[PDB]
Structure formats: structure tokens, C-alpha cells
Design a protein around this ligand. Structure first.
Ligand code: PTY
Ligand SMILES: *[C@@H]1O[C@H](CO)[C@@H](O[C@@H]2O[C@H](CO)[C@@H](O)[C@H](O)[C@H]2NC(C)=O)[C@H](O)[C@H]1NC(C)=O
Ligand SMILES: *[C@@H]1O[C@H](CO)[C@@H](O[C@@H]2O[C@H](CO)[C@@H](O)[C@H](O)[C@H]2NC(C)=O)[C@H](O)[C@H]1NC(C)=O
Ligand SMILES: *[C@H]1O[C@H](CO)[C@@H](O[C@H]2O[C@H](CO)[C@@H](O)[C@H](O)[C@H]2NC(C)=O)[C@H](O)[C@H]1NC(C)=O
Length: 170
């Protein structure tokens, strides 16, 4: 199993307070941890897979991701009103299938334990995973599918960064 899986659980008590609990596993082994309130997040490699400077850049990218993740949640609230508290789960990663000619990548999002939206990475597009249409789901997808961040930068993170990471460290 040549893969890197990442799990991020975000607990929002309201738009302005989020508590993060996350971790990543490479080849089936725990390798990273995400922990703490938005005001002081700990992001660490459990193994020094990356050198200090390299790690410093990856860490910075994760920090910027969280900042925009939180930003999007506040915008959806601002525009469509969300019912707090709420918990969001992001499960994403990449795998080099044993008999594949290409990496399999994914990013799925659940809200309060139910399917909400998921990324179709190769086309960098988001889809609803819920059975019914909702102002919240629709507006969220509109934002996710609008900007170059929530689309192309994420596609690059999964298809290129994650895959290069697995190829180098596994
Ligand atoms: C590379 C291997 C690294 C391995 C070690 C990492 C593990 C750390 C600890 C484990 C914790 C798990 C949580 C980490 C998951 C986050 C993924 C990181 C994303 C990231 O760095 O990408 C940035 C892009 O930002 C964005 O894409 C911003 C988009 C924000 C919104 C996302 C939407 C989903 C949620 C929907 C919310 C709806 C709410 C309404 C109810 C720039 O990345 P880059 O520097 O590589 O550049 C690539 C392009 N060049
Ligand atoms: C991140 O850590 C969580 C919590 O330990 C892992 O979830 C556990 O996974 C094992 C094996 O799949 C299950 O038997 C446990 O019941 C899970 N516990 C919880 C809290 O749900 C999770 O697999 C880890 N994910 C990554 C990508 O590292
Ligand atoms: C996510 O789940 C939580 C339940 O843990 C929901 O919070 C409850 O919301 C109802 C309706 O407003 C209130 O009667 C309860 O007082 C809330 N519980 C707590 C602990 O405060 C929340 O509404 C859900 N959010 C979404 C978007 O589904
Ligand atoms: C939260 O993050 C860490 C702890 O998770 C804090 O780091 C320091 O906190 C105190 C500073 O006065 C020290 O007493 C701790 O020993 C030290 N922790 C270690 C061992 O690194 C940090 O200050 C908090 N948030 C920030 C970045 O200010």
C-alpha cells in the first residue's frame, strides 16, 4: 500500500471558534498529527521524513489551508446561515494502486457525520454527495467550484504534491 491518507476533523462551536483534530498515515503508519484550537494549532511530523526547511514549507501550506477552510465556513454562514455547533470531517489522500497506471486521489467531506460534498480531483470539480438540494450545499459548491484555490491548487496538492510525497518517502 503506497499511499498517504489524511484525516481532518473540525469542530465548530460557532463561526469563530474551531477545534482541530487530524492525522496522516503513510503506507499504513501514523506519520503526522494536527491538533488544537484555531488560535494555536500544532502540526508536526511524527517522523522527520522531511528536512527542517522542507517541513517548514509544508507546514506553512497546511496553515494557509486551514485559514482558508475556516474562511469558507464563515462565508457560508455569513451568506446562508449555518446551524452551529457542527463538525466537519475531511478525508483525503493519494494511493499508487498495486496494479494501476495512475494514482487514485480523493477528498471527501462530511458534516455532522453525513455525506456533504466530495472532490472529483482530476477535473478539479466538487460535487454534492447529499440526496437533496440545499441553499447551504448549493452555495458551498458555488464557492468551491468558483475560485482557483478550492479548485486547481487542491488538484495540484492531491495529484502532484501528495503523489510525489508517496514516491519519495515510501
Ligand atoms: C504533501 C504531503 C504532506 C503530508 C503531511 C501533511 C499532514 C499534516 C497533518 C495531518 C492533518 C490532516 C489535515 C490536512 C489536510 C489539508 C491538506 C493540505 C492542503 C494544502 O496544503 O494545499 C494548499 C491549497 O489550499 C486549498 O486547497 C484551500 C481550499 C480550502 C477549502 C477546502 C474545502 C473543503 C471543505 C468544505 C467546507 C464546507 C463548509 C460548509 C458547511 C496549498 O498546497 P501546496 O503548497 O502544495 O500547493 C499546491 C498548488 N501549487
Ligand atoms: C487518524 O487517527 C484516527 C484515530 O485514531 C484513526 O481512526 C481509527 O482507525 C482505526 C483503524 O482504521 C479504527 O479501528 C479506529 O476505530 C479509528 N478510530 C476513530 C477515532 O475513528 C484514523 O484511521 C487515522 N487516519 C489517518 C489517515 O491517519
Ligand atoms: C450538527 O449537530 C449538532 C448536534 O450535536 C446540532 O446542534 C444542535 O442543533 C439543534 C437545532 O438548532 C439545537 O436544538 C441543539 O441545541 C444543538 N445541540 C447543541 C449541542 O448545541 C447542529 O444543529 C447540527 N448542525 C448541522 C449543520 O447539521
Ligand atoms: C500553544 O502551542 C504550544 C503548546 O501546544 C505553546 O508552546 C509553548 O507554550 C508555553 C509558552 O509560554 C511554554 O510554557 C511551553 O513549554 C511551549 N510549548 C512547547 C514545549 O513548545 C504555544 O505557546 C501556544 N501557542 C502559541 C504559539 O503561542
Amino acid at each position: 500500500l503506497q499511499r498517504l491518507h489524511m484525516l481532518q476533523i473540525s469542530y465548530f462551536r460557532d463561526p469563530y471558534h474551531v477545534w482541530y483534530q487530524g492525522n496522516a498515515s503513510l503506507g499504513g503508519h501514523l506519520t503526522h498529527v494536527l491538533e488544537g484550537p484555531d488560535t494555536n494549532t500544532t502540526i508536526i511530523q511524527l517522523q522527520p521524513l522531511q528536512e527542517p526547511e522542507s517541513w517548514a514549507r509544508t507546514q506553512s501550506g497546511l496553515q494557509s489551508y486551514l485559514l482558508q477552510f475556516h474562511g469558507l465556513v464563515r462565508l457560508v454562514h455569513q451568506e446562508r446561515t449555518l446551524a452551529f455547533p457542527l463538525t466537519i470531517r475531511c478525508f483525503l489522500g493519494c494511493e499508487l494502486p498495486p496494479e494501476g497506471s495512475r494514482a487514485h486521489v480523493f477528498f471527501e467531506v462530511a458534516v455532522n457525520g453525513s455525506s456533504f460534498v466530495s472532490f472529483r480531483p482530476e477535473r478539479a470539480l466538487w460535487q454534492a454527495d447529499t440526496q437533496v438540494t440545499s441553499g447551504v450545499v448549493t452555495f458551498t459548491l458555488q464557492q468551491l467550484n468558483a475560485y482557483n484555490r478550492t479548485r486547481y491548487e487542491l488538484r495540484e496538492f492531491l495529484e502532484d504534491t501528495c503523489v510525489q510525497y508517496v514516491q519519495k518517502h515510501i
